[PDB]
């Protein structure tokens, strides 16, 4: 057992939001194409990540993030 890593925290959020298992979320998976996120899901995902990691993502940067790895990569910075 261990404390939640950055990756585990990101994937739990995505899983709870999109109704998929936290295992089933792969790092290279696209939110819209692979995971099936609609035009509300993606907004609520950013909100959830902002809340979880106590950060503020500008609309410019959020537009860049389209895959799970990109979300993880952004949080490891910033």
């Amino acid at each position: 057992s261990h404390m939640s890593t950055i990756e585990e925290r990101v994937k739990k959020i995505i899983g709870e939001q999109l109704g998929v298992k936290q295992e089933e979320v792969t790092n290279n998976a696209s939110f819209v194409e692979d995971l099936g996120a609609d035009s509300l899901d993606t907004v609520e995902l950013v909100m959830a990540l902002e809340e979880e990691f106590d950060t503020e993502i500008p609309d410019e940067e959020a537009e860049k993030i389209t895959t799970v790895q990109a979300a993880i990569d952004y949080i490891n910075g910033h």
Binding site: L40, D41, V43, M47, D59, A62
Partner: protein, 378 residues
């Protein structure tokens, strides 16, 4: 916080770039329209369609989505005309004028409760109770169930705003269940025993769920926006004591004064459309599927239509503001809203000869709504 205190400086910066501005605010990308001519043209154009404020096929908030999607405000052809025509009977000039006695008597009753106190909160003591009493009376909601309506309205209005959260939408879904269940029950009673109200008029073609969502829509509109018009107008006049003296000395100026209050501090700051095809306007191309956000308060400050647009002038004539929208979806209850505001403000100024200010705006971007408005008098 700085945006809420003065959004018009923000609108001005967008307008200087382009009256149709491509950008993204609060994570919502699209075209943000600050120009008057552009706003009016888009609202007039049926190619720019209304749409559900949550994704069409989303069942995350299943009950909230169902309630919203049945409302005429988010419906296009041919369902829009059907729904609008059926509800229109309660808001005709003639029927609206017949509400005047009840509005005058309610206004006096509410001011009686505070007359001796030398102090009041304009929203809680005056603006809200009036608007709540009037709309509940028109719809046919019993006086015992009036407080429950207030809670539903305040919760459901947030579900359409940019400032909405996961928590607000979850709360919204619960209130959607409650409101729909209540109006279905009230419809069953009116089916057996019709009364002199709008529910009965609706039942006299429309499903019982479409009637319920119609009632919910009118209940929210009757509460939220009309309350804001009254309270915004009072603040406006008190911040400009010089056309408040002027309206006090001549109550016949109430008509043109209310219109300038509508232009200057519009209760509704935003509405929205989606492009159903590729559309060329004002030297830009809006592609199919892209979202268009019409900033009505910004359009009302367009210096090419209103000279010295940041000046509050109650003698402005005419006043072709867009506060009630434009085109097919133009406000259904605009006559009622105007009447409530006219009577409320004129009577207040008559009965409180020495009215003075003792401010915070609610965290809504699509609406300009005060948290409270404490005043003193006599």
């Amino acid at each position: 916080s700085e945006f809420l205190k003065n959004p018009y400086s923000f609108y001005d910066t967008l307008r200087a770039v382009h009256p149709i501005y491509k950008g993204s605010f609060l994570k919502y990308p699209g075209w943000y329209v600050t120009g008057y001519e552009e706003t009016a043209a888009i609202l007039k154009d049926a190619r720019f369609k209304v749409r559900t404020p949550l994704p069409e096929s989303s069942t995350k908030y299943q009950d909230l989505s169902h309630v919203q999607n049945q409302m005429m405000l988010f419906q296009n052809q041919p369902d829009h005309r059907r729904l609008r025509t059926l509800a229109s009977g309660a808001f005709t000039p003639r029927t609206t004028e017949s509400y005047q006695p009840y509005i005058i008597e309610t206004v006096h009753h509410l001011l009686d409760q505070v007359q001796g106190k030398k102090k009041m909160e304009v929203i809680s003591d005056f603006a809200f109770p009036l608007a709540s009493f009037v709309i509940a009376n028109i719809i046919g909601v019993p006086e015992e169930d009036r407080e429950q309506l207030k809670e539903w309205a305040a919760s459901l209005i947030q579900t359409i705003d940019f400032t909405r959260s996961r928590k607000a939408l979850t709360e919204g879904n619960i209130m959607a269940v409650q409101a729909m269940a209540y109006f279905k029950e009230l419809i069953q009673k009116r089916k057996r025993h019709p009364q002199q109200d709008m529910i009965s008029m609706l039942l006299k073609k429309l499903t019982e769920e479409e009637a319920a969502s119609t009632c919910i829509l009118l209940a929210i509109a009757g509460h939220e926006t009309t309350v804001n018009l009254i309270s915004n107008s009072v603040l406006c006049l008190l911040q400009h004591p010089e056309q408040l003296l002027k309206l006090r000395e001549n109550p016949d100026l109430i008509g043109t004064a209310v219109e300038e209050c509508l232009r200057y501090e519009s209760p509704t700051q935003m509405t929205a459309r989606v492009a159903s095809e590729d559309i060329d306007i004002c030297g830009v191309t809006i592609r199919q599927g892209e979202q268009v956000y019409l900033l009505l308060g910004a359009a009302n400050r367009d210096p090419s239509i209103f000279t010295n647009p940041d000046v509050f002038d109650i003698t402005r004539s005419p006043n072709p503001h867009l506060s009630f929208g434009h085109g097919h979806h133009v406000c259904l209850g605009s006559s009622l809203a105007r009447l409530e505001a006219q009577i409320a403000i004129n009577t207040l100024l008559q009965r409180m000869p020495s009215l003075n200010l003792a401010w915070r705006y609610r965290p809504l971007f699509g609406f300009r709504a005060l948290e409270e408005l404490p005043v003193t008098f006599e």
